[PDB]
């Protein structure tokens, strides 16, 4: 079972993580049943 | 294939189902069904196993 758990904060702070307590709700657990061993974040890129 | 040919000479078409159990969980599952609710009285509750 591949569980994401999820939580949208509205901070306000500009650089690090802000200090605070914010429990993540469960969003979606997946039936993969698949071996995971790394990952990568993807980006959107700007063109002009 | 003619209309007019004999029953085993006509065209059937043939599906087979193939049902396997891996080590992934099993996601394809057959329908559970439901009664009606019956409340303030001590009855057997299953709900969702």
């Given at each position: 079972?591949?569980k ?45 | 294939?003619?209309?007019?040919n004999?029953?085993?000479?006509q ?11 891996l ?8 329908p ?12 057997n ?5």
């Amino acid at each position: 079972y591949f569980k994401i758990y999820s939580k949208h904060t509205p901070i306000n702070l500009v650089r690090d993580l802000p200090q605070g307590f914010s429990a993540l709700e469960p969003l979606v657990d997946l039936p993969i049943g698949i071996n995971i061993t790394r990952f990568q974040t993807l980006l959107a890129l700007h063109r002009s | 294939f003619q209309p007019t040919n004999g029953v085993g000479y006509q065209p059937y078409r043939v599906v087979v189902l193939s049902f396997e159990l891996l080590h992934a969980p099993a996601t394809v599952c057959g329908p559970k069904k439901s009664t009606n609710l019956v409340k303030n009285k001590c009855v057997n509750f299953n709900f969702n196993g």
